[PDB]
Design a protein around this ligand. Structure first.
Ligand SMILES: *[C@@H]1O[C@H](CO)[C@@H](O[C@@H]2O[C@H](CO)[C@@H](O[C@@H]3O[C@H](CO)[C@@H](O)[C@H](O)[C@@H]3O)[C@H](O)[C@H]2NC(C)=O)[C@H](O)[C@H]1NC(C)=O
Ligand SMILES: *[C@@H]1O[C@H](CO)[C@@H](O[C@@H]2O[C@H](CO)[C@@H](O[C@@H]3O[C@H](CO)[C@@H](O)[C@H](O)[C@@H]3O)[C@H](O)[C@H]2NC(C)=O)[C@H](O)[C@H]1NC(C)=O
Ligand SMILES: *[C@@H]1O[C@H](CO)[C@@H](O[C@@H]2O[C@H](CO)[C@@H](O)[C@H](O)[C@H]2NC(C)=O)[C@H](O)[C@H]1NC(C)=O
Ligand SMILES: *[C@@H]1O[C@H](CO)[C@@H](O[C@@H]2O[C@H](CO)[C@@H](O)[C@H](O)[C@H]2NC(C)=O)[C@H](O)[C@H]1NC(C)=O
Ligand SMILES: *[C@@H]1O[C@H](CO)[C@@H](O[C@@H]2O[C@H](CO)[C@@H](O)[C@H](O)[C@H]2NC(C)=O)[C@H](O)[C@H]1NC(C)=O
Ligand SMILES: CCCCC/C=C\C/C=C\CCCCCCCC(=O)O
Ligand SMILES: *[C@@H]1O[C@H](CO)[C@@H](O)[C@H](O)[C@H]1NC(C)=O
Ligand SMILES: *[C@@H]1O[C@H](CO)[C@@H](O)[C@H](O)[C@H]1NC(C)=O
Ligand SMILES: *[C@@H]1O[C@H](CO)[C@@H](O)[C@H](O)[C@H]1NC(C)=O
Ligand SMILES: *[C@@H]1O[C@H](CO)[C@@H](O)[C@H](O)[C@H]1NC(C)=O
Ligand SMILES: *[C@@H]1O[C@H](CO)[C@@H](O)[C@H](O)[C@H]1NC(C)=O
Lengths: 48, 32, 49, 49, 234, 49
C-alpha cells in the first residue's frame, strides 16, 4: 500500500519507445514530456 | 581519393650502392 | 560571448572554450604556456587562463 | 526513414568465424579495432560465398 | 654525379609498438668526416619514414614491401616542407625498380641545383606507384640548425604527430601539431634511405638522427615557471 | 557519412571531430532511434555540454 498514486497517461507510439527513456535528448524529452524522478516512479508502455 | 599527380614516366630506376660498413659509426646518445 | 573585466574578484560561472565551471577571476602576471590556454595544478584543477 | 539520406547497401554481412588452420586457433577482435580476417571478409558473403 | 651511397635501411621492418621519438639535429654545428670520404661542418637532415600494417617480400625475395595503405612521411623543398600522405604503393617493373631482378633498394633524393618543392615526391614516384590516396597534408618548417625532436604515436583517435618546433624551438619539449585519420593499427616502420646528389664543390656532412621506442611508463616531470619541462625522472 | 553507402560491421568507418561545432538536432532528426545505451555519460549531457 501507499499514500498516493498518480497516473500520467497519453497515446504514444511504440516505435518511439527510446525517446521516453531516461537521459534521452529527442523531441519527446525536450518539448513533450520529461519524467519526474523525485518520487518512486514507474513508466509502462503497453498496447490495447 | 585525393589526386597525387602523374605517374613517373621514367622506365629505369636509379642505381644505388648499398654499403653498410661505411655507415657503421657510433656517436652514442642515450635518453637522459 | 561575455567579458570578465567587470566580474573580477567575485564567484562567477565560466565557459572557456568549452571548459565549464565556477570560480573567482583576477588579473595576474602570465605563467605557464600561452598556446595551451589552460594552467592546472597537481590536483587537476583550473588555476589560470 | 528516407532512402535519399544515405545510399542503401546491397545486404547486411558479418563474420561468423575467423581462425587459422583449425577453429581452435580462432582470432578474436579487440576493443575498438579491426578483425585479423578483414582482407578475407572484404570479398563479401553471399548465397554462393 | 655518381651512384647513390646508402645503407640497408630498407628491408628493416622494425615493430611500431607504441610509437617512437626521433632526435634530430644533434651535432649540427660541429665538424665530422664524410661517410663516402672518411670532413666538413655537419648540418641537420630530416628523416623520412614509411609506416604500415602488413609487410612482405618483393617480387624476387627482397624484403621490405608494405602492403595495403601505407603512411609515408617525406621531407620536401630541401628540408623546408614536410608532406604526409596515405596511399597504396604499387611497385614498378623498370630495369632497377623493385619489381625487377636488378633490385637492391629504393631511395629518395633531392638535387640541390625558385624551389621545385616536389623533387622528393618525384624521386619517390620513380620507385613506387601511388594509388587510392586518402589524404595528403603539408607543413612548413623554418630552416635553422637547432636540435629538434619529432615523434609519432597511434591511438583510437588516429595517428598523432609531435614536434618540438611548435612550443619549444630551443628546448626538447614536444607538442602535437596534427592528427591523421589512420585508424588501422600500425605495426611496422622503416626509415627510407635518402641521398643528396650534390657536386664535389657542394658536398656536405649531415647529422645523424636517433630513433627511440616509446613505452607506457610513469615519469616525474619538473615544470618550470614558464611551463617548460627541463628535468624528468624515469 | 551521407556521401556513400555505409560499410559492414567488420569494416566499420571512423570519424573523429575536433575544434568544430555540429548541429546535433539536424543529425538526430534524420534517424529514427530505436535503442541507445550510454556509459558514464548521458545523451542530454552530450547535447548540453
Ligand atoms: C592487402 O593487400 C593484399 C594484396 O597483397 C590483399 O589480398 C588480396 O585481396 C584480393 C581481393 O580480395 C584477392 O583477390 C581475390 O583472389 C581470389 C582468388 O584467391 C579471387 O577468387 C577473387 O575474385 C579476388 O580476385 C587476392 O587474392 C589477395 N591476395 C593475397 C596475396 O592475399 C588484401 O585484401 C589487402 N587487404 C585489405 C584489407 O584490403
Ligand atoms: C648552431 O648554431 C646556430 C647559430 O645561428 C644556432 O642557432 C641559434 O641558437 C640560439 C640558441 O641556441 C638562438 O638564440 C635564441 O634566440 C631567441 C630569440 O630569437 C632567444 O629568445 C633565446 O633565448 C635564444 O637566445 C638563436 O636565435 C639561433 N639563431 C639562429 C639563426 O637560428 C643553433 O642553435 C646551433 N645548433 C646547435 C648548437 O645544435
Ligand atoms: C606536386 O605534386 C603534387 C602531386 O604529387 C601536386 O598535387 C596535385 O596536383 C594536381 C595537378 O595540378 C592537382 O590536380 C591536385 O589537386 C593536387 N593535389 C593536391 C594539391 O593535394 C602538386 O600540385 C605539385 N606541386 C606543385 C607546386 O605543382
Ligand atoms: C570498407 O568500406 C569502405 C567504404 O564502404 C570501402 O572503401 C571503398 O573501397 C572501394 C574499393 O576498395 C573503392 O572503390 C571505394 O571508393 C571506397 N569507398 C570509400 C568511401 O572509401 C573499403 O574498401 C572497405 N574495406 C574493406 C576491407 O572491405
Ligand atoms: C540545425 O538544423 C535545423 C534543422 O533540423 C535547423 O532548423 C531550421 O531552421 C531554419 C531557420 O532557422 C528553418 O527555416 C527551418 O524550417 C528549420 N528546420 C527544421 C526542420 O525545423 C537549424 O537552423 C540548424 N541550426 C541550428 C543552429 O540549430
Ligand atoms: C542517430 C545517431 C548518430 C547521429 C550522428 C552521430 C553522432 C552524434 C553524437 C552524439 C549524440 C548522441 C545522442 C544520443 C542518442 C540517443 C538518445 C535519443 O535520441 O533518443
Ligand atoms: C592586467 O594586467 C596586465 C599586467 O599587469 C596589464 O597590462 C593589463 O592592462 C591589465 N588589465 C586589466 C583589465 O586590468
Ligand atoms: C526511394 O524509394 C522511393 C519509393 O518508391 C523511390 O520512388 C525512390 O526512387 C527511392 N530513392 C532512391 C534514391 O532509391
Ligand atoms: C642490414 O645490415 C646489417 C649490418 O650487417 C645487418 O645486421 C642486417 O641484418 C641487414 N638487414 C637485412 C634486412 O639484411
Ligand atoms: C609492368 O607494370 C605495368 C603496370 O604496373 C603493367 O601494365 C605491365 O604489364 C608490367 N609489365 C610486365 C612485363 O609485367
Ligand atoms: C608556407 O605555407 C604556405 C601556406 O600556408 C605556403 O603557401 C608556402 O609555400 C609555405 N612555405 C613558405 C616558405 O612560405
Amino acid at each position: 500500500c501507499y499514500s498516493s498514486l498518480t497516473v500520467d497517461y497519453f497515446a504514444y507510439p511504440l516505435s518511439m519507445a527510446s525517446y521516453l527513456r531516461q537521459g534521452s535528448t529527442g523531441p519527446i524529452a525536450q518539448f513533450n514530456y520529461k519524467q519526474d524522478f523525485t518520487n518512486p516512479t514507474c513508466r509502462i508502455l503497453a498496447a490495447v | 581519393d585525393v589526386d597525387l599527380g602523374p605517374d613517373s614516366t621514367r622506365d629505369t630506376c636509379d642505381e644505388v650502392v648499398v654499403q653498410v660498413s661505411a655507415f657503421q659509426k657510433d656517436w652514442p646518445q642515450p635518453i637522459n | 560571448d561575455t567579458k570578465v573585466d567587470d566580474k573580477l574578484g567575485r564567484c562567477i560561472e565560466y565557459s572557456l572554450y568549452g571548459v565549464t565551471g565556477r570560480g573567482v577571476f583576477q588579473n595576474c602576471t602570465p605563467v605557464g604556456l600561452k598556446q595551451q590556454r589552460f594552467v592546472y595544478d597537481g590536483f587537476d584543477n583550473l588555476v589560470g587562463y | 526513414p528516407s532512402n535519399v539520406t544515405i545510399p542503401l547497401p546491397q545486404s547486411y554481412m558479418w563474420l561468423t568465424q575467423c581462425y587459422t588452420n583449425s577453429p581452435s586457433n580462432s582470432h578474436y577482435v579487440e576493443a575498438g579495432s579491426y578483425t585479423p580476417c578483414l582482407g578475407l571478409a572484404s570479398r563479401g558473403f553471399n548465397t554462393f560465398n | 654525379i655518381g651512384k647513390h651511397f646508402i645503407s640497408n635501411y630498407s628491408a628493416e621492418t622494425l615493430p611500431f609498438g607504441n610509437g617512437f621519438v626521433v632526435r634530430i639535429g644533434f651535432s649540427a654545428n660541429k665538424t665530422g668526416s664524410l661517410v663516402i670520404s672518411p670532413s666538413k661542418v655537419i648540418k641537420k637532415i630530416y628523416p623520412a619514414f614509411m609506416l604500415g600494417t602488413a609487410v612482405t617480400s618483393f617480387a624476387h625475395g627482397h624484403a621490405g614491401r608494405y602492403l595495403n595503405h601505407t603512411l609515408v612521411i617525406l621531407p620536401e623543398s630541401c628540408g623546408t616542407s614536410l608532406t604526409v600522405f596515405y596511399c597504396i604503393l604499387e611497385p614498378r617493373n623498370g630495369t632497377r625498380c623493385p619489381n625487377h631482378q636488378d633490385y637492391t633498394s629504393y631511395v629518395i633524393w633531392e638535387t640541390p641545383h625558385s624551389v621545385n618543392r616536389n623533387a622528393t615526391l618525384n624521386s619517390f614516384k620513380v620507385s613506387f606507384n601511388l594509388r587510392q590516396c586518402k589524404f595528403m597534408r603539408t607543413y612548413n618548417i623554418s630552416d635553422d640548425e637547432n636540435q629538434e625532436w619529432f615523434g609519432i604515436t597511434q591511438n583510437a583517435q588516429g595517428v598523432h604527430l609531435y614536434s618540438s618546433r611548435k612550443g619549444d624551438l630551443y628546448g626538447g619539449n614536444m607538442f602535437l601539431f596534427d592528427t591523421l585519420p589512420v585508424y588501422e593499427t600500425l605495426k611496422y616502420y622503416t626509415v627510407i634511405p635518402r641521398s643528396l646528389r650534390s657536386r664535389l664543390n657542394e658536398r656536405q656532412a649531415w647529422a645523424a638522427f636517433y630513433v627511440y621506442s616509446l613505452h607506457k611508463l610513469t615519469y616525474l616531470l619538473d615544470f618550470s615557471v614558464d611551463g617548460y619541462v627541463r628535468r624528468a625522472i624515469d | 557519412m551521407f556521401s556513400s553507402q555505409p560499410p559492414q560491421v567488420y569494416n566499420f568507418s571512423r570519424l573523429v571531430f575536433t575544434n568544430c561545432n555540429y548541429n546535433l538536432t539536424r543529425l538526430l532528426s534524420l534517424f529514427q532511434v530505436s535503442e541507445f545505451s550510454c556509459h558514464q555519460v548521458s545523451p542530454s549531457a552530450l547535447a548540453s555540454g
